[PDB]
Amino acid sequence: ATFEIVNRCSYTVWAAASKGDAALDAGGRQLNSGESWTINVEPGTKGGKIWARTDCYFDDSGSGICKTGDCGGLLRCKRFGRPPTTLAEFSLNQYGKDYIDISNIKGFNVPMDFSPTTRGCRGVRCAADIVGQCPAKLKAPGGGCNDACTVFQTSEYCCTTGKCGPTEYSRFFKRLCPDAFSYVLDKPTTVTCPGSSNYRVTFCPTA
Template identity: 65%
Template structure:
């Protein structure tokens, strides 16, 4: 498989390891996968009867993604299909993906633990390649999208 594909080795029924996004060796993940991983995030039937959705690179990037509404007159989909793994800065490189700087450096500047942080050169690397995706934790204004509740969605990995 190429560098933009998840690599899975079966070890037994219901168990296996992924090069990126691994969930402690179980195939039915009930928690968070190990970074780097591209995330599709959504909250349905929220404030003002809206669905909120985004693609997040806050945990890094491993596979390209398309997250699009398919009904309800909502047409604004989002994509992150850039060659982030191939262009990843050396300090953020990981097998099969590109880490977010918080994962690597663990400082408030990159993790936003104090509540006050802004974009960095590393977050701009992600944002320049995937303008619709979250690039750091406070990147709400350009990265959260809405549709009326009841909308159907399609999430495609490696479009």
Template identity: 60%
Template sequence: LAHTQAATFDITNKCPYTVWAAAVPGGGKQLTNGQTWTINVAAGTTAARIWARTGCNFDGTGHGGCQTGDCGGLLNCQAYGTPPNTLAEFALNQFNNLDFIDISLVDGFNVPMDFSPTSNGCTRGIRCTADINGQCPAQLKTQGGCNNPCTVFKTDEYCCNSGSCGPTDYSRYFKTRCPDAYSYPKDDQTSTFTCQGGTNYRVVFCP
């Protein structure tokens, strides 16, 4: 592979409260207001995601749990988190050596997010900063966040298990507030962004 350099991701918490950042691959770290955690992600990594966890308690061995985004009770995530969680998703050095990045609300929303390239001449970032929790439809409201309809209703219409689903009133709730983010699983056209491979990135909670 010509491009073997890892990509750097700077993960910063600008929320007025503590979050426990999570990354797969990468693990997890408690971030108080203003703190940054930097991870290096190997070239060619796919199906990766970064998110914030809220309302966490961990013991000295890194076991415990979180109100939102919990990953099997571990501080150092090895697996994806539990909805609702606002997701930064990415795959590096894919087709034509492009990185594919997105913010997804397919697993619901817990913390506002900015996901942006910081190098390589790539300038198009993604933001989702609306008050989605405050205005969340009653059926989707949950402790600390706004759930996705698949988690709540578990029907094919919302979960897209058959692969032939379209937008719904619930997905439009998210889409109108965060037009650059995935609102349901087939929302690719308006929600996936690319940079040349070898780009570095930042994720900011509560930008």
């Protein structure tokens, strides 16, 4: 499938795409305000994620650091990034269907729209000012709003026993972005699309 990744933010982001144990396409790229990056993701990919990273510094060998979403110091991500990271998540061609969602389970750094560019389903979006409204205990040192699991490392926030409920922190994310996962057992906001659809991920969709 084809994913177009568009930075509509007024600031530069460094996009990333990975399935956890491997890069998706090149794995990462600088996107200045307005730039688009088209990647190809192999059909059948399960557990793919796309995210933005902010305030990065890379040397000429693609090595460095980002204040949000860093994937072990690399420009071309092979692994997932450090929270906080708004997440576009997807699994393609699973029994004839694509599954997409946005998740705030690992916090939020940049607003995002995740939409098909082919027929047959709707997109999802989380574009509220989560960073502006972020509870004080969840604010990150480098911009962004962490999830409660990352900050407090409890069974209830991280849902480690597989039994857990919504929380005060959970409900904050859910209230600003009802279409995104707010905690591990949140009622799914997954969207089902036809197998082999194509997609656009837009950072800072409203502008």
